[PDB]
RNA sequence: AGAUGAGACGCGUUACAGUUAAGGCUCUGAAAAGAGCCUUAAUUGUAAAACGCCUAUACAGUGAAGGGAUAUACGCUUGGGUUUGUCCAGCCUGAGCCUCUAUGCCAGAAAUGGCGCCUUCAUCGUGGGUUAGGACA
DNA sequence: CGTTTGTACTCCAGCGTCT
DNA sequence: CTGGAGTACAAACG
């Protein structure tokens, strides 16, 4: 009777297979699932916000340019230049201008100031009030509509859509007063909490009946405070927690960033259990728990498989009855770095703030005088190795403090970057870490066995360096993270870094050390 | 005790062009030094920030009329684009519908009204959606 | 003897406030 | 962070 145990946890997960008829342990290990982080969806959303904001800005500039060319203010006129230069800084409008407003922000102005400047610029440009109000509407116009009321939806519950806490507050406060020792005052406290004209009499209850502080905190939270978040209300479990009618509805995939680690568990399950073992019962309810149950009954080839509810994690897995994951080379990941690099005359350069460079990077700056002032300022202050300069250290200023804030910028040269990583998209130049997708081994003439890199097809028309390939017969092609053997060696090796002579790793028994062997001497396992 | 999602505000980066300041080099002058080129920094303007894939039976603007909780959609059901070697998440969207979910701003105590918004028509144009994230090959 | 690949070493990567 | 860059150093085949 083979039993599979899942010790699912947050950072680590134990896996074990035990035969319960003899207490014989046949398989056990522990692992992590989390990649680098699955919170790079936050950086994806930040880039999505930057991209959509830039698209909206380009869209509005296009529309306002079209309208002003329709009126007659061509790009030669000073009126067009004045209003069109103002359109790049609209100013915020969520906060209405009236000491507090001046101490709030020091840049971006405000929408009313900007549109007052538009009124001034167009009354200097002989415009009518119709044209001025149309330009005012173009500045105030929304292009991508603000739809953020019910976007994500906690859904209908067979156990464990749903409405906001904003709209069903009466049910929550009733759930608070459900466990009170007084009956006739329940509806009175209901009328007291929900009415803002009856706010004062609620505080009498906490001294009259000596309730717990948690109860008082909950009542004050319901008192027009906890307005955010969705409750669990649906057609079922409106007010109760009855566990009847199991498996009434299907299960959907609404739990983002948890699928990643659940299928990371199921990857080693599929790779190490199903080809070799047959399990009669699996033991590990939450949405992820239900999803994981459905995925094991999908993968095991049995829709009715019984699934029921740091070496100590592996021990707990054995009682219930190494290996890290990481990736950035997939098709879903970033082609190239976010901040573009200057690539002139074969020299790779980037501006940086003076306040960012630290003591370990003394002599990378191009300009000599500011380099010297940087190192004397390093010895002037306590800013030793690894510390970036502060604004208080910027109070002893560098040359020509900026108009907007007390910093200064210098060019610098970037190491760890070569001509093979350069791609140019439009006018920009970025570096990439996905530029190799495979190693093509060629043999030609008398048997000259040599290898080339397969450049990435998505970027192949954008590389600055032409892709070197002479003619030959392609006999072999490797990819990243493959199993590979070495000519003249008995062990099995795995590729960590590829290109020319790929960097290969021991599949077992390594201690962090690496070794390189050319792809000519290489063959898969 | 966190989840992912919508929309902006800005700072940073890159390209091209302009102005100013400092330094170096070169030509010339009788000389003071005049001029030209380069470098670095400040500042100003414009443009780019996935590659791509799909869409013109689409998208967008203007004008008129009607509707607007009895209704619409950020909702439900079922399809489509992103989509690929295969399946998805997220976002956008076609048709029908209101079981679940949500419904903005101004005024009027309030009933309610006016804006935003949706639909139809006319006219004008080329624009629009999604792409830095996963999993199995 | 004169090249030619394999090894250590150092370094590289967008960031704030709001509703 | 992972996938890779340049750079100084070394031992081996042609």
Numbering used by the authors: 4 to 101, 125 to 186, 190 to 212, 214 to 314, 448 to 472, 494 to 505, 540 to 743
Task: Recite the paper's sentences.
Here, we report the cryo-EM structures of a Cas9d nuclease (747 amino acids in length) in multiple functional states, revealing a stepwise process of DNA targeting involving a conformational switch in a REC2 domain insertion. To cleave a specific site in dsDNA, Type II CRISPR-Cas nucleases associate with a single guide RNA (sgRNA), a chimeric CRISPR RNA (crRNA)-trans-activating crRNA (tracrRNA), targeting a region complementary to the first 18-24 nucleotides of the 5ʹ end of the sgRNA, termed the spacer. These nucleases cleave the target and non-target strands using the HNH and RuvC endonuclease domains, respectively. We show that Cas9d contains an intricately folded sgRNA that acts as a structural scaffold to anchor flexibly tethered protein domains. Structural comparison of Cas9d with other Cas9 nucleases and the ancestral IscB reveals a common ribonucleoprotein core furnished with increasingly large protein regulatory domains, which were acquired during evolutionary specialization.
